[PDB]
Design a protein around this ligand. Structure first.
Ligand SMILES: Cc1cc(O)c2c(c1)C(=O)c1cc(O)cc(O)c1C2=O
Length: 328
């Protein structure tokens, strides 16, 4: 059966912690007062929640209220415990309160207000500098959560809220996030298609923080090449094909061979044989101002099949691509 894997960083951060930290099932929700929040405008609805702009009438402050759909008790407390564990971390959305919505009969999570513009709204028109700036901002969030024993598992532009006026970013929607426990098998049905890492797509369950670094790489590629999304699969199978047309099939074989796993036989008729491409082939007159050798080397080091060989968040922050970004 499959060869086991472990994160190369923050491997044992949870094993050491008190039960209370990661055992979200035992978490006791502290409830605030639902009457403090008045919904103003519905902003979105997803599989797991409806999202509102609201106002907190105890301070007159705008907030964002997320009213959870019924799903699995356990998922609610997981997201809650994660948010409280991460609260105050860099670029992590701040859970301000948790109230019981009297209509839905479910928890409503109250977040700090963020401008109603996701990253996908502007990330195809940022300058080279701004891409590097915002990527470093994302990396701060991801190294923070990974250092706290947590993988986001749904990194994508919709989950990065950007207030470009204020050059401020928050990583949101922690409802798929999970505690990393060495040796634990996880559900591969996480992340959105275009951002799923190869480990998800080959059903390798013993994955870790590095899943998020694949997702980040897909964001990077789509920004610097101005191609949204960068790996544009029609489904989860073609999604792997799309990656193999860039990263080549021999390295895909080397990856699954290293972990002693087998592709779905469904790939026999669709995968073909593909050489690894040089990143230069995605450069053209319209995106060349966004591409530099550093950008390409950084991207190359994120988009690796072998989740063990991807830059970690902290390594990525060390990369020369960020030398041009002014650090606070
Ligand atoms: C259209 C839209 C606008 C938003 O401001 C948010 C969201 C969606 C959203 O899904 C969201 C999820 C979350 O877990 C925290 C948030 O602050 C949010 C949001 O803030």
């Amino acid at each position: 059966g499959p060869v086991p894997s472990r994160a190369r960083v923050y491997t044992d951060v949870n094993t050491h912690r008190p039960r209370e930290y990661w055992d979200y099932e035992s978490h006791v929700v502290e409830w605030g007062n639902q009457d403090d929040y008045q919904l103003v405008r519905k902003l979105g609805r997803g599989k797991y929640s409806e999202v509102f702009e609201a106002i907190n009438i105890t301070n007159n402050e705008k907030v964002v209220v997320k009213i959870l759909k019924p799903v699995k008790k356990k998922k609610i407390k997981r997201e809650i415990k994660i948010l409280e564990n991460l609260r105050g971390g860099p670029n992590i959305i701040t859970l301000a309160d948790i109230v019981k919505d009297p209509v839905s009969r479910t928890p409503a999570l109250v977040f700090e207000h963020v401008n109603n513009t996701d990253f996908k709204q502007l990330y195809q028109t940022l300058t080279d500098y701004d891409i590097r700036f915002y990527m470093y901002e994302i990396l701060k969030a991801l190294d923070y959560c990974h250092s706290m024993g947590i993988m986001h598992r749904d990194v994508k532009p919709h989950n990065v809220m950007i207030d470009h006026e204020h050059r401020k970013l928050r990583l949101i929607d922690w409802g798929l996030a999970e505690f990393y426990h060495p040796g634990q098998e996880y559900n591969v049905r996480v992340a959105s298609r275009y951002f799923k890492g190869p480990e998800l797509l080959v059903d390798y369950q013993m994955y870790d923080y590095s899943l998020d670094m694949w997702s980040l790489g897909c964001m990077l590629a789509s920004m610097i090449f101005r191609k949204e999304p960068f790996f544009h699969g029609h489904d989860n199978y073609d999604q792997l094909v799309r990656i193999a047309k860039v990263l080549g099939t021999e390295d895909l074989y080397d990856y699954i061979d290293k972990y002693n796993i087998e592709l779905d036989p469904r790939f026999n008729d669709i995968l073909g044989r593909h050489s690894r491409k040089r990143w230069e082939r995605f450069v053209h007159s319209e995106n060349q101002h966004l591409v530099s050798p550093e950008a390409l080397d950084f991207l190359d080091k994120l988009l690796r099949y072998d989740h063990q060989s991807r830059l970690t968040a902290r390594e990525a922050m060390e990369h020369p691509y960020f030398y041009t970004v002014v650090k606070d």
